[PDB]
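Marked as duplicate of an earlier ticket. Keeping the data here for the record.
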Amino acid sequence: GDSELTTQDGEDFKSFLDKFTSSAAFQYTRVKFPLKTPITLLADDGETEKTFPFTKEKWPLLDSETMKEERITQEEGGIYVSKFTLNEPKHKIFEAGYEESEVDLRVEFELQADGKWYVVDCYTGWYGYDLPIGELKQTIQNVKEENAAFKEIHP
């Protein structure tokens, strides 16, 4: 303990990501909002896309097991791929979905001039294009139930 190491050109990926996977209370300290990815619910109109506020209220506490890269080869569904899409110094994407279908998950990180990394995407199917404008609050309840397990194991 004591000292610090943070270098002089912005923090490592691995350095911020380490506490990302292993501290709930710290995830809240490194995120932009509304993000690139707002929630967008098809309205009562059945054609009107209407966005909603992205905030901490709708922050599912993610774990270290989503941070794996694989390429599942099915024959009765599709090729499920979790692999990087851009390799920049200050910017780092992580998309998972079928090879040629939707994504379940997008997570994106921008390094800020503060030298701390910040999340800029919070897509995870929880806020996918698959829930109606009515069922919003139901999901936000149940996001707290998943978030309890995470924080009981590794807060």
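See parent ticket for discussion. The chain has three helices and seven strands.
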